Write an enzyme that holds these catalytic residues in place. Structure first.
Site, PDB file in Angstrom:
ATOM      1  N   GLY A  30       0.811  -1.218   0.000  1.00 50.99           N
ATOM      2  CA  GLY A  30       0.000   0.000   0.000  1.00 50.99           C
ATOM      3  C   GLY A  30       0.840   1.261   0.000  1.00 50.99           C
ATOM      4  N   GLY A  32       0.451   5.794  -0.523  1.00 51.68           N
ATOM      5  CA  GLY A  32      -0.434   6.950  -0.497  1.00 51.68           C
ATOM      6  C   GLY A  32       0.169   8.148   0.195  1.00 51.68           C
ATOM      7  N   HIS A  36       3.353   4.440   3.649  1.00 53.16           N
ATOM      8  CA  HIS A  36       3.465   3.097   3.079  1.00 53.16           C
ATOM      9  C   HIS A  36       2.941   2.060   4.023  1.00 53.16           C
ATOM     10  CE1 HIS A  36       6.905   5.351   1.110  1.00 53.16           C
ATOM     11  NE2 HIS A  36       6.208   4.924   0.043  1.00 53.16           N
ATOM     12  N   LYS A  54       2.453   0.095   8.809  1.00 48.65           N
ATOM     13  CA  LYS A  54       2.275   1.433   8.244  1.00 48.65           C
ATOM     14  C   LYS A  54       3.451   2.335   8.630  1.00 48.65           C
ATOM     15  CE  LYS A  54      -1.186   5.207   8.640  1.00 48.65           C
ATOM     16  NZ  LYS A  54      -2.621   5.435   8.983  1.00 48.65           N
ATOM     17  N   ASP A 146     -14.472   9.824   6.895  1.00 46.58           N
ATOM     18  CA  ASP A 146     -13.951   9.500   5.553  1.00 46.58           C
ATOM     19  C   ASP A 146     -14.124   8.005   5.250  1.00 46.58           C
ATOM     20  OD1 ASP A 146     -12.687   9.882   3.027  1.00 46.58           O
ATOM     21  OD2 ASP A 146     -10.654   9.953   3.866  1.00 46.58           O
TER      22      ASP A 146
HETATM   23  C1  LIG Z   1      -4.529   7.783   7.171  1.00 45.41           C
HETATM   24  O1  LIG Z   1      -4.782   6.397   6.923  1.00 45.41           O
HETATM   25  C2  LIG Z   1      -3.884   5.893   5.943  1.00 45.41           C
HETATM   26  C3  LIG Z   1      -3.898   4.368   5.790  1.00 45.41           C
HETATM   27  N1  LIG Z   1      -5.066   3.760   5.110  1.00 45.41           N
HETATM   28  C4  LIG Z   1      -5.364   4.305   3.769  1.00 45.41           C
HETATM   29  C5  LIG Z   1      -6.455   3.345   3.227  1.00 45.41           C
HETATM   30  C6  LIG Z   1      -5.835   1.985   3.648  1.00 45.41           C
HETATM   31  C7  LIG Z   1      -5.084   2.278   4.975  1.00 45.41           C
HETATM   32  C8  LIG Z   1      -3.685   1.656   4.984  1.00 45.41           C
HETATM   33  C9  LIG Z   1      -3.693   0.140   4.809  1.00 45.41           C
HETATM   34  N2  LIG Z   1      -4.669  -0.559   5.650  1.00 45.41           N
HETATM   35  C10 LIG Z   1      -4.528  -1.937   5.941  1.00 45.41           C
HETATM   36  C11 LIG Z   1      -4.389  -2.430   7.267  1.00 45.41           C
HETATM   37 CL1  LIG Z   1      -4.322  -1.403   8.681  1.00 45.41          CL
HETATM   38  C12 LIG Z   1      -4.281  -3.805   7.466  1.00 45.41           C
HETATM   39  N3  LIG Z   1      -4.319  -4.664   6.455  1.00 45.41           N
HETATM   40  C13 LIG Z   1      -4.453  -4.265   5.196  1.00 45.41           C
HETATM   41  C14 LIG Z   1      -4.583  -2.910   4.886  1.00 45.41           C
HETATM   42  C15 LIG Z   1      -4.719  -2.478   3.468  1.00 45.41           C
HETATM   43  C16 LIG Z   1      -3.540  -2.421   2.719  1.00 45.41           C
HETATM   44  C17 LIG Z   1      -3.569  -1.997   1.416  1.00 45.41           C
HETATM   45  C18 LIG Z   1      -4.775  -1.619   0.797  1.00 45.41           C
HETATM   46  C19 LIG Z   1      -5.945  -1.655   1.534  1.00 45.41           C
HETATM   47  C20 LIG Z   1      -5.925  -2.076   2.865  1.00 45.41           C
HETATM   48  C21 LIG Z   1      -7.109  -1.199   0.656  1.00 45.41           C
HETATM   49  S1  LIG Z   1      -6.150  -0.096  -0.429  1.00 45.41           S
HETATM   50  O2  LIG Z   1      -6.700   0.067  -1.730  1.00 45.41           O
HETATM   51  O3  LIG Z   1      -5.619   0.994   0.315  1.00 45.41           O
HETATM   52  N4  LIG Z   1      -4.879  -1.145  -0.518  1.00 45.41           N
HETATM   53  C22 LIG Z   1      -4.033  -1.440  -1.679  1.00 45.41           C
HETATM   54  C23 LIG Z   1      -5.886   0.135   6.127  1.00 45.41           C
HETATM   55  C24 LIG Z   1      -5.810   1.667   6.169  1.00 45.41           C
END
Ligand SMILES: COCCN1CCCC12CCN(c1c(Cl)cncc1-c1ccc3c(c1)CS(=O)(=O)N3C)CC2
Lengths: 336, 270
Positions: A30, A32, A36, A54, A146
């Protein structure tokens, strides 16, 4: 500096470091503005379980980062994602958060079906657990702010198989998309409310039922094309249907740019019929109570959970997948 | 303005309860490393002093008492685990403001303004204690922030007896008499260390009782309508009444140079 030496070195010797504890390099899943996320594993043979690492953007610690950690440290509910640990890197000033790992989520589940439909028992069960988690947050005076498909995670194969886990709650300041945003925010409202989260749930629920984002829109305070789409699904609101629309900062901009007659044969009933969802059904009637223009006419988290849709056959289940194999693919890694 | 309601009604499963209500003897046992230098007396004076710094700054930066309450516990929590020599309490003072004002979404107090807030409160309200200018800069706060975050195991959400206080008065119906006084007694309890030993609902009922004595309000019948430990409530009152006899006798301005010079000094690097 003026700090004690014996205090620094002792703490420095004992401090756990994320790079020493976890294997994550090359395992980025992930990317954004936030930073990461990696699917990490522990380097020891203590457990072969997965974890979400994260790495937050920027040095120091932002208000958003402070707020996410504060709330995650207190919140405890089966349908809200758990913070395991926080790592503080005194060398480079970076902060890492350790979560349990969710293989799937609504963004990826929906994309699979739109590339194909969601079993209806699966939808009901998703909706119930999303409502269960949001009700918990609202009972504790924490708003999501959000809520999108990329936040609603689902646990894959493991001890929590097929359980919804909500993330990223309680710290969003006010290309990015507004498809899950409530019309009050689009018309200029300056604060987050429990009603805003309920609209989001209404949008997600519709998309679970059809695979299309109900308010899908072109990418670009006040957002014309987004509202155009809302009125094309919902109809344009009557004065009676939303009396305090006049109080919205962008009401006079709404009257300039729009005309009630343009959306004269538009309504949610007619929208959902095109996607084979019958408006006599308990599902539609619940959806209509969530997707209400006026926020004060929008039902609560708890009221939604009491709805007769959830007493209709089939009942929802702890396992969203309901026993049968998960067809959804696992998360592919990234590179750049 | 308005205050952070997040997690209201969940003290009983909080980071606050389950890790930051500390047994009294444990607290006094860690303090014996510092009582080599300062007396038991001079040490409680030292708390009162810094508590008042965490208020001055907190006023100067236009923060609300709920931020401050939290800022003051962060500070207390640090030096209830580590010696005064570890990190300067001057430095920790506004590092606790800074973090608390972020943790509750009040605002990112800017760099320039956090440091002049620092210089000014000391330049004006405290030139008896700290003669020369506030020596630190933003990197020192930023470092100090990471240590502060580490010690608390990121337990950042805190509580104060204010919110339960407001609930209690709204039965009696003396918002035009009681609440103002009670609210300051709860403020003054921060000079002591009850908020590390006692759950706030009790600190509220303690302050509300002292208030009822000061203004000669008959509240006897009301206090006997509570399925609560009244001895533990009576323990807190003693502490609150003692707090005022200590105030009477403590000449902060005449005593704090000497008490601060007696603090244990940091060891320098090699
Ligand atoms: C301020 O906040 C930022 C972090 N936010 C942004 C949206 C996702 C998120 C970071 C990843 N996240 C995960 C967790 Cl904690 C545990 N397991 C998997 C995921 C995860 C990983 C990747 C992924 C998704 C979900 C859907 S996606 O389209 O972003 N993508 C490719 C949830 C929160």
């Amino acid at each position: 500096d003026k700090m004690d030496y014996d205090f620094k070195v002792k703490l420095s010797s004992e401090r756990e470091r994320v790079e020493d504890l976890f294997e994550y390099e090359g395992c980025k899943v992930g990317r954004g503005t936030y930073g990461h996320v990696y699917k990490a594993k522990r380097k020891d043979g203590k457990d072969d379980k997965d974890y979400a690492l994260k790495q937050i953007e920027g040095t120091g610690i932002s208000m958003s980062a402070c707020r996410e950690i504060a709330l995650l440290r207190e919140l405890k509910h089966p349908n809200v994602i758990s913070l395991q640990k926080v790592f503080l890197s005194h060398a480079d000033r970076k902060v890492w958060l350790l979560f349990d790992y969710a293989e799937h989520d609504l963004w990826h589940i929906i994309k699979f079906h739109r590339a194909s439909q969601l079993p209806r028992g699966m939808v009901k069960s998703l909706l119930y657990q999303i409502l269960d988690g949001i009700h918990y947050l609202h009972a504790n005076w924490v708003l999501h702010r959000d809520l999108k498909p990329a936040n609603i995670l689902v646990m894959g194969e493991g001890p929590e198989r097929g359980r919804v886990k909500i993330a990223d709650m309680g710290f969003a300041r006010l290309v990015v998309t507004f498809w899950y945003r409530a019309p009050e925010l689009l018309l200029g409202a300056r604060h987050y409310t429990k009603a805003i989260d309920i609209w989001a749930i209404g949008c997600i629920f519709a998309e679970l039922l059809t695979s299309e984002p109900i308010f899908h829109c072109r990418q670009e305070p006040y957002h014309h094309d987004q509202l155009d789409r809302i009125f094309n699904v919902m109809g344009f609101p009557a004065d009676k249907d939303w009396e305090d629309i006049k109080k919205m900062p962008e009401h006079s901009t709404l009257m300039k740019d729009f005309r009630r007659n343009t959306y004269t044969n538009c309504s949610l009933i007619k929208y959902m019929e095109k996607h084979k969802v019958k408006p006599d059904s308990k599902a539609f009637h619940l959806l209509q109570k969530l997707l209400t223009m006026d926020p004060i006419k929008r039902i609560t988290s708890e009221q939604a959970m009491q709805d007769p849709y959830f007493l209709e056959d089939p009942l929802p289940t702890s396992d969203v997948f309901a026993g049968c194999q998960i067809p959804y693919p696992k998360r592919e890694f990234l590179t750049e | 303005d308005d205050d952070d309601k997040a997690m209201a009604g969940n003290f009983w499963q909080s980071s606050h309860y389950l890790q930051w209500i500390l047994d009294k003897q444990d607290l006094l046992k860690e303090r014996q490393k510092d009582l080599k230098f300062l007396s038991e007396e001079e040490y409680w004076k030292l708390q009162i002093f810094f508590t008042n710094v965490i208020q001055a700054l907190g006023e100067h930066l236009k923060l609300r008492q709920q931020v401050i309450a939290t800022a003051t516990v962060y500070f207390k929590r640090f030096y209830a685990r580590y010696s005064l020599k570890s990190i300067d309490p001057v430095l920790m003072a506004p590092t606790c403001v800074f973090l608390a004002s972020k943790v509750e979404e009040f605002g990112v107090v800017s760099n320039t303004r956090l440091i002049a807030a620092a210089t000014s409160v000391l330049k004006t309200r405290f030139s008896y204690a700290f003669p020369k200018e506030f020596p630190y800069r933003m990197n020192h706060i930023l470092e100090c922030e990471f240590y502060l975050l580490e010690l608390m195991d990121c337990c950042l959400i805190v509580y104060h007896p204010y919110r339960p206080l407001l609930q209690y008065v709204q039965d009696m119906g003396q918002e035009d008499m009681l609440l103002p006084l009670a609210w300051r007694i709860v403020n003054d309890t921060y000079r002591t260390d009850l908020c590390l030993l006692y759950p706030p609902f009790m600190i509220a009922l303690a302050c509300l009782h002292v208030a009822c004595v000061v203004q000669q309000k008959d509240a006897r019948q009301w206090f006997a309508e509570l399925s609560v430990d009244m001895e533990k409530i009576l323990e807190i009152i003693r502490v609150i009444l003692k707090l005022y006899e200590q105030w009477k006798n403590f000449d902060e301005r005449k005593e704090m140079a000497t008490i601060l010079s007696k603090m244990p000094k940091p060891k320098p690097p090699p």
